Amino acid sequence: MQQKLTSPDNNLVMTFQVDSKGAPTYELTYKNKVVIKPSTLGLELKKEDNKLDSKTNLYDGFEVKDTQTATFDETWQPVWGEEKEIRNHYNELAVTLYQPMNDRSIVIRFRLFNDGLGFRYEFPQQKSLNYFVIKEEHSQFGMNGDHIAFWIPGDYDTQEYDYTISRLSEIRGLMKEAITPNSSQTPFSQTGVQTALMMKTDDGLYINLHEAALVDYSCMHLNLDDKNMVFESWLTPDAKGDKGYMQTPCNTPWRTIIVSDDARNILASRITLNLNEPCKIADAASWVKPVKYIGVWWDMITGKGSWAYTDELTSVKLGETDYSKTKPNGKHSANTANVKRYIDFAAAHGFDAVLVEGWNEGWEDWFGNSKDYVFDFVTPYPDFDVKEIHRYAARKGIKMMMHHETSASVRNYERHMDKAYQFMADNGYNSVKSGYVGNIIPRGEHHYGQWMNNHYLYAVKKAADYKIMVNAHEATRPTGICRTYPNLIGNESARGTEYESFGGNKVYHTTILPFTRLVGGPMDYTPGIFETHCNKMNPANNSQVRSTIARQLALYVTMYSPLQMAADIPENYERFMDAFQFIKDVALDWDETNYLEAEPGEYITIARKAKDTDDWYVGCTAGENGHTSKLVFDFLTPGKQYIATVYADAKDADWKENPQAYTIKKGILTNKSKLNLHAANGGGYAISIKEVKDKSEAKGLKRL
């Protein structure tokens, strides 16, 4: 009767069966500890526009018709990632479920790894199941206790919320305050949360609930039954309230449960990526590449500068408004002379590209007007010389990063997309930062519905045809699709550094993101703010970045991404050029990654080996209690000497009272070295460890 699937190491066991009413039921244990209590699986379908009642049932009345098992064990290499190779090793169980009352069958495929379980529903092409609409997916995740969760409010339009750390039973009472103001937001439940969801159990376990390969389907959130402690899939509705237009053969994305008694193993898990389809960009390795950049950006985010060219018009209309006849507001940062200054800085310090926002016509009306024809993505303002900027950047060996804020007007963006990408190709742009700020147009749709998920992928696939890399802000959070389309080098899709200018992010924010948001794909977090007091940029902005300078440096290692921005303005980096050296030195791609220390909400310490080098980089980020590390460099090569530079919080450093106090020490390290470092409140540290290649490097240096 019951089906049992075991992980390769025998530590995890998944038991499957249908109850007495034919409802698919599964459960999972880890080291003999209950991780997932008996939980049901199934979906309810929309009644077909006027048997008709029984057809809506795709949740019970099932009989196990057939079962197939198999084992997979292959290694693959991502174009860019946290390590050179990833091993995909799992035991699989596929259950064919027949539903007599509707004469149709579905398949539930289970893949069990040593670090977690993944499952998905498969809908075979058959006589009685072709086109169908999903009313709701009912995938349950029954918890064995009132765990501690690290969560953000379930929302169909934004994920730019600070995390909350509380018991599952406390979520309901905390939801109201957890939902802060945002340009576009649609919370759905007093107990709804987003994925990836991170939890810590009283019996020493760490559990992460998420999904993988979100394609041709609506984004999954989780709704908590806080009486029975059961999380259940809650999909994003379209403009009519429906949750998915399907056509067999088709599959739902995978649902994942990553678990371990060691928090570091959650970060090390590659289940999400392993469950995605293999790379579909044949020549990816020839053009896809990591990018370290700076940009004309923080000016506008802080309010010092503006995206708009003029402030004298009540509104603008592309093709009618003649900007050449308008009065400059004197705050437009995207002007040729200023852009060249950034290009100079980028070239002088080894950066790959320079982002510039506010370069094109239309910014006057970019915010909250639900404007359809808001941008054309190709017409520059009078003070932005596309060709001259291109000429200069190219001569300096710098690439300009295109900016495509859509103001959430999606049909408008698609209509202009080919011309926009061609414009990029014709003017030397091979990477683009897109955005979707505001309520979606078509009006009625949400940012994470099936409709928009299709758009985001459409944009990435078309970009691949033009050999363009994409960094999409406000898009649906990643679920590992980067394996399939490596040109998607980034997404924000979470609360980033920009909010440190909008009131600030919680001190423990970066000690949570790697356990949640980063599972499924890198984030364009835009770290590197040295002048943490925003009033120095804009007197009217009293927001303060909750970090020390040393912790900002650490983020280049603790916030993984092949796309890394040094977000502050050149002048501020010039004020602390000694600390800036770490940002200049740090790599963007890795051959190896060692998670040294990890505890969600408290601290994260990671060491990574730069790809194709013998150099290592270390970073530690900590919460309000700071953190003391006892580092052991036994991961370094035996018999080798290393030049180590330690960027750490000075004594009494503090994110609030003394954020710019840091020390820099240079010495020698070997695999026998041990170091004690203390991360302050909202602080951390960064270490560059370069293999000695010449005696004339250790001169005057002593062992640390």
Ligand X SMILES: C[C@H]1O[C@H](O[C@H]2[C@H](O)[C@@H](O)[C@@H](O[C@H]3[C@H](O)[C@@H](O)[C@@H](O)O[C@@H]3CO)O[C@@H]2CO)[C@H](O)[C@@H](O)[C@@H]1N[C@H]1C=C(CO)[C@@H](O)[C@H](O)[C@H]1O
Active site residues: 498
Q: Could you give the CA distance from residue 457 to residue 472 in angstroms, rounded to a whole number? A: 10
Q: Is 182 annotated as a binding residue?
A: yes
Say whether 160 counts as a known binding-site residue.
Answer: yes
Instruction: Provide the CB-side half-sphere exposure for 223 (13 A, CA).
Output: 14
Through-space distance between the first and last CA atoms of the chain, rounded to whole angstroms: 62
Q: Which two tokens stand for residue 38?
A: 């008996």
Piece of 109-117, 285-293, 496-504, 632-640 that binds ligand X (CB under 6 A): 496-504
Closest CA to 144 of 12, 25, 35: 35
Phi, psi (deg, nearest 5) at residue 15: -110, 130
Q: Write down the least CB distance from residue 437 to ligand X, Å.
A: 5
301 sits near ligand X (criterion: CB under 6 A)? yes
Interaction pattern, residues 147-176, with ligand X; x per rule: CB under 6 A: -------------x----------------
Which of ligand X, Ca ion, a copy of itself, none sits in contact with 467, Cβ below 5 to 8 A by type?
none
- The residue (of 157 and 352) whose beta carbon lies closer to ligand X is 157
183 is in an annotated binding site: yes
474 is known to lie in a ligand binding site: yes
Q: Does 442 bind a copy of itself (CB under 8 A)?
A: yes
CA distances from 377 to 239, 358, 458 (A): 27, 11, 17
Stretch that binds ligand X, among 17-25, 258-266, 338-346, 498-506 (CB under 6 A): 498-506
Place of tokens 């950049």: 293
Q: Which stretch binds a copy of itself (CB under 8 A): 106-114, 142-150, 291-299, 313-321?
A: 313-321
Apex 499 CA angle, 493 and 503, nearest 5: 150
Nearer to Ca ion, 61 or 490 (CB): 490
User: How far is residue 395's CA from residue 428's CA, in Å, rounded to a whole number?
Assistant: 12
Please, which residue, 307 or 582, has the CB nearer to ligand X? Answer: 307
The token duo for 650 is 């000075």
- Identify which of 513, 507, 466, 512 has the alpha carbon closest to the alpha carbon of residue 491: 513
Question: With binding defined as CB under 8 A, does residue 50 bind a copy of itself?
Answer: no
On whether 82 is known to bind a ligand per the annotation, the reply is no
Q: Is 369 in the site for a copy of itself (CB under 8 A)?
A: yes
Q: Which does 126 bind (CB under 5 to 8 A by kind): Ca ion, ligand X, a copy of itself, none?
A: a copy of itself
Q: CB neighbours (10 Å) of residue 427? A: 15
Q: Which is nearer to a copy of itself, 181 or 278 (CB)?
A: 181
| Site track 415-454 with ligand X (rule: CB under 6 A), x = hit | --------------------x-x-----------------
Strands 33-40 and 24-30: antiparallel
Considering only 67, 69, 228, 247, the residue that binds a copy of itself (CB under 8 A) is 247
Does the annotation flag 561 for ligand binding? no
**Antiparallel, parallel or unpaired: β 563-565 and 291-296:** parallel
- Please answer whether residues 557 and 565 qualify as being in contact, where contact means their C-beta atoms are separated by less than 8 angstroms: no
Q: Which of 155, 492, 500, 568 binds ligand X (CB under 6 A)?
A: 492
Six-digit token pair at 140?
A: 């349950």
Q: For residue 354, with 0-12 CB atoms within 10 Å meaning exposed, 13-18 middle and 19 or more buried, which class applies?
A: buried
- The least distance separating a copy of itself from the CB of residue 677, rounded to whole angstroms, comes to 50
465 C-beta neighbours (distance < 10 Å), count? 11
**Can you point out the beta strands (E) in 100-168?**
104-113, 116-123, 131-137, 140-142, 148-151, 164-167
632 touches which of Ca ion, a copy of itself, ligand X, none (CB within 5 to 8 A by kind)?
none
Strand partners, 355: 295, 401
User: If binding is defined by CB under 8 A, does position 372 make contact with a copy of itself?
Assistant: yes
Are 208 and 38 in contact, with CB atoms under 8 Å apart? Answer: no
Among 147, 473, 477, 551, binds ligand X (CB under 6 A): 473
Give Cα 182 distance to the centre of its chain: 19
What length is written for the chain?
704
Judged on CB neighbours under 10 Å (0-12, 13-18, 19+), 696 is: exposed
Residue 543 interacts with ligand X (CB under 6 A): yes or no: yes
In the complex with ligand X, the residue whose CB is nearer, 99 or 491, is 491
Pick one of 17, 182, 538, 663: the residue that binds ligand X (CB under 6 A): 182
Name every residue whose Cβ is closer than 8 Å to that of residue 343 and which is 6 or more positions away in sequence. Answer: 354, 389, 392, 393, 396, 398
β-strand partners of 22: none
By a kind-dependent CB cut-off of 5 to 8 A, residue 370 interacts, out of Ca ion, a copy of itself, ligand X, none, with: a copy of itself
The reply to whether 315 sits near a copy of itself by the rule CB under 8 A is yes
Per CB under 6 A, 278 contacts ligand X: no
| Binding-site residue ranges for substrate | 181-183, 403-405, 473-474
Residues that bind Ca ion in the complex, under the rule CB under 5 A: 473
| Binding-site residue ranges | 160, 181-183, 403-405, 473-474, 492, 498
Residues that bind a copy of itself in the complex, under the rule CB under 8 A: 125-127, 130-131, 133, 238-240, 242, 245, 247-248, 314-315, 317, 369-372, 411, 414-415, 418, 442-445, 451, 454, 458
| Binding-site residue ranges for Ca(2+) | 160, 474, 492, 498
Residues that bind ligand X in the complex, under the rule CB under 6 A: 160, 181-183, 297, 301, 357, 405, 435, 437, 473-474, 492, 498, 502-503, 543
